[PDB]
Design a protein around this ligand. Structure first.
Ligand code: YK8
Length: 177
């Protein structure tokens, strides 16, 4: 679909994963700045396949005249079995909206890839794709496209800006010790 973040940070692959995929204060501050409230999540849970599973719910406060003031959302995060601690993290995040128009007809798939670059460095790669169900006809999908890609771009750029500010204070704190 679209590649929104491709960057090497001066944060370890371990710390980057715990920043993004645990109930970190970093994520709480970032979600608030994006008007995402009432974040509820699970711990990472193992299943028979070997992959790990984490699910979240939250409410997105919307600025769209075509939508209501709020929409419920559900996120299912899949950490693939191929991941190795502090070395390689590959998460597939599927996001469902529940109160926007045509919410039954599409969802979003975000793939997060964290690979350790050096000793305290990592490369984060986030790609985004829209998925469709029930075969939305004609005008429905073009409306979905024009009301998603720009909001997803705005979302992940603010995350990259916050990760860079995090990199600047965390790498300094580690280096100074
Ligand atoms: C047809 C037309 C009336 C639809 C308009 C309303 C749709 C929204 C509001 O335009 C949706 C579409 C994609 C939705 C985003 C998809 C993925 C994520 C990543 C996750 O971490 C945090 C929530 C977030 C940013 C979702 C936010 C809500 C988005 C942006």
């Amino acid at each position: 679909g679209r590649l929104y973040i491709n960057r090497v940070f001066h944060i370890s692959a371990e710390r980057m994963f715990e920043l993004l995929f645990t109930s970190s204060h970093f994520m709480q501050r970032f979600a608030n700045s994006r008007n995402i409230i009432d974040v509820v999540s699970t711990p990472w849970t193992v299943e028979s396949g070997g992959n790990q599973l984490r699910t979240m719910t939250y409410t997105i406060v919307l600025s769209n005249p075509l939508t209501g003031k709020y929409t419920a959302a559900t996120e299912k995060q899949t950490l693939y079995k191929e991941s190795r601690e502090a070395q390689f993290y590959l998460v597939d995040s599927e996001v469902l909206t529940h109160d926007v128009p045509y919410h039954d007809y599409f969802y979003t798939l975000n793939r997060y890839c964290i690979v350790r670059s050096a000793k305290q460095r990592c490369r984060l790669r986030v790609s985004t794709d829209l998925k469709y169900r029930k075969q939305p006809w004609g005008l429905i999908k073009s409306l979905i496209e024009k009301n998603s890609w720009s909001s997803l771009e705005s979302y992940f750029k603010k995350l990259e800006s916050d990760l860079l500010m995090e990199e600047s204070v965390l790498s300094q704190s580690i280096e100074d010790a």
